[PDB]
Scaffold this motif. Structure first.
Motif, short mmCIF file in Angstrom:
data_model
loop_
_atom_site.label_atom_id
_atom_site.label_comp_id
_atom_site.label_asym_id
_atom_site.label_seq_id
_atom_site.Cartn_x
_atom_site.Cartn_y
_atom_site.Cartn_z
N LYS A 1 0.82 -1.22 0.00
CA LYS A 1 0.00 0.00 0.00
C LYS A 1 0.85 1.27 0.00
O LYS A 1 0.45 2.26 -0.64
CB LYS A 1 -0.96 0.05 1.16
N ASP A 2 1.98 1.24 0.71
CA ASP A 2 2.92 2.40 0.80
C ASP A 2 3.61 2.65 -0.54
O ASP A 2 3.65 3.79 -1.03
CB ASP A 2 3.96 2.15 1.91
N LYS A 3 4.13 1.58 -1.15
CA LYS A 3 4.89 1.70 -2.41
C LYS A 3 4.00 2.00 -3.61
O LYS A 3 4.46 2.55 -4.62
CB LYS A 3 5.66 0.39 -2.68
N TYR A 4 2.74 1.60 -3.52
CA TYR A 4 1.84 1.72 -4.64
C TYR A 4 0.56 2.40 -4.22
O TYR A 4 -0.50 2.05 -4.69
CB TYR A 4 1.58 0.34 -5.25
N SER A 5 0.68 3.42 -3.36
CA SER A 5 -0.47 4.17 -2.86
C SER A 5 -1.33 4.72 -4.00
O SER A 5 -2.55 4.75 -3.90
CB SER A 5 0.00 5.32 -1.96
N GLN A 6 -0.68 5.14 -5.08
CA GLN A 6 -1.37 5.72 -6.21
C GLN A 6 -1.38 4.80 -7.42
O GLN A 6 -1.59 5.25 -8.55
CB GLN A 6 -0.73 7.08 -6.57
N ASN A 7 -1.14 3.50 -7.19
CA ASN A 7 -1.30 2.48 -8.22
C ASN A 7 -2.27 1.39 -7.76
O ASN A 7 -1.87 0.40 -7.12
CB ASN A 7 0.06 1.89 -8.61
N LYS A 8 -3.54 1.58 -8.08
CA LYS A 8 -4.59 0.65 -7.69
C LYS A 8 -4.53 -0.67 -8.46
O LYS A 8 -5.06 -1.67 -8.00
CB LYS A 8 -5.96 1.26 -7.93
N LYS A 9 -3.91 -0.67 -9.64
CA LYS A 9 -3.77 -1.90 -10.40
C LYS A 9 -2.89 -2.88 -9.65
O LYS A 9 -3.24 -4.05 -9.51
CB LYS A 9 -3.20 -1.63 -11.78
N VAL A 10 -1.75 -2.40 -9.15
CA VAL A 10 -0.83 -3.27 -8.38
C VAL A 10 -1.54 -3.79 -7.12
O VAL A 10 -1.48 -4.99 -6.81
CB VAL A 10 0.49 -2.58 -8.04
N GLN A 11 -2.22 -2.89 -6.41
CA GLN A 11 -2.96 -3.29 -5.21
C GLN A 11 -4.01 -4.36 -5.52
O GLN A 11 -4.12 -5.38 -4.80
CB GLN A 11 -3.65 -2.08 -4.56
N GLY A 12 -4.77 -4.12 -6.57
CA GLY A 12 -5.84 -5.02 -6.97
C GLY A 12 -5.35 -6.37 -7.42
O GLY A 12 -5.94 -7.39 -7.06
N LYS A 13 -4.29 -6.39 -8.23
CA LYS A 13 -3.74 -7.65 -8.70
C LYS A 13 -3.16 -8.43 -7.52
O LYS A 13 -3.39 -9.63 -7.41
CB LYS A 13 -2.65 -7.44 -9.77
N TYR A 14 -2.42 -7.78 -6.64
CA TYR A 14 -1.86 -8.49 -5.48
C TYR A 14 -3.00 -9.13 -4.65
O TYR A 14 -2.93 -10.29 -4.25
CB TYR A 14 -1.02 -7.57 -4.61
N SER A 15 -4.04 -8.34 -4.39
CA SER A 15 -5.21 -8.84 -3.68
C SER A 15 -5.78 -10.08 -4.39
O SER A 15 -6.04 -11.10 -3.74
CB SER A 15 -6.24 -7.73 -3.58
N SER A 16 -5.94 -10.02 -5.71
CA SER A 16 -6.54 -11.12 -6.45
C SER A 16 -5.69 -12.38 -6.35
O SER A 16 -6.23 -13.49 -6.14
CB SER A 16 -6.76 -10.76 -7.94
N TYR A 17 -4.37 -12.21 -6.51
CA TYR A 17 -3.44 -13.34 -6.54
C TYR A 17 -3.35 -14.00 -5.15
O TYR A 17 -3.24 -15.20 -5.06
CB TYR A 17 -2.04 -12.97 -7.08
N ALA A 18 -3.36 -13.20 -4.10
CA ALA A 18 -3.40 -13.73 -2.74
C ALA A 18 -4.65 -14.56 -2.53
O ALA A 18 -4.60 -15.61 -1.90
CB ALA A 18 -3.34 -12.61 -1.71
N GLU A 19 -5.77 -14.08 -3.05
CA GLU A 19 -7.06 -14.77 -2.89
C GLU A 19 -7.14 -16.07 -3.69
O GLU A 19 -7.78 -17.04 -3.25
CB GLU A 19 -8.21 -13.83 -3.27
N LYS A 20 -6.47 -16.12 -4.84
CA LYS A 20 -6.56 -17.30 -5.69
C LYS A 20 -5.47 -18.33 -5.40
O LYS A 20 -5.60 -19.50 -5.76
CB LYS A 20 -6.53 -16.86 -7.14
#
Length: 152
Positions: A21-40
């Motif tokens: 979240k700190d490194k990619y505060s303004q990159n929601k794509k990175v946040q979203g993909k990481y979230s998706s991959y953790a979930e899958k």
């Protein structure tokens, strides 16, 4: 013991998701993909094994890579959201398995610093299954904090 290991898992998940979240505060794509991959990841692990799943994460990354040892991976060096997120997830899961939450802590890993993908190819089926349980446990924490902290 479960109490203290749950405490260490929560601490580590908070640390790694906070870093994203700190490194990619303004990159929601990175946040979203990481979230998706953790979930899958748990499903991939159940259907293919932890070893194959770690190799799967590496297969996604732009090549060549210096060293796929998890300490050498720089997630922030990849050039799209998907690669950055897979590199992070590989690195986070590997770090948990090899080092836990640190030498200082109540859990310092299962592999004694050996690269987990390599450890998995060498140890007994039962020891691999134990590491798989631990992988699934940290992934569950990561998932929970991703849903708390990160954009989808």
């Amino acid at each position: 013991d479960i109490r203290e290991i749950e405490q260490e898992r929560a601490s580590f998940a908070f640390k790694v998701v906070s870093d994203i979240k700190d490194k990619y505060s303004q990159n929601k794509k990175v946040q979203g993909k990481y979230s998706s991959y953790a979930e899958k990841a748990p499903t991939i692990i159940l259907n293919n094994g932890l070893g194959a799943t770690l190799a799967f994460f590496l297969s996604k990354l732009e090549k060549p890579i210096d060293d796929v040892d998890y300490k050498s991976i720089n997630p922030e060096s990849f050039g799209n959201a998907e690669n950055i997120a897979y590199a992070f997830l590989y690195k986070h899961l590997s770090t948990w398995l090899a080092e836990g939450n640190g030498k200082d802590s109540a859990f310092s890993g299962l592999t004694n610093g050996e690269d987990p993908l390599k450890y998995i190819m060498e140890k007994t089926a039962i020891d691999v299954a134990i590491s798989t349980e631990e992988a699934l446990s940290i992934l569950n924490w990561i998932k929970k904090f991703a849903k708390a902290m990160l954009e989808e």
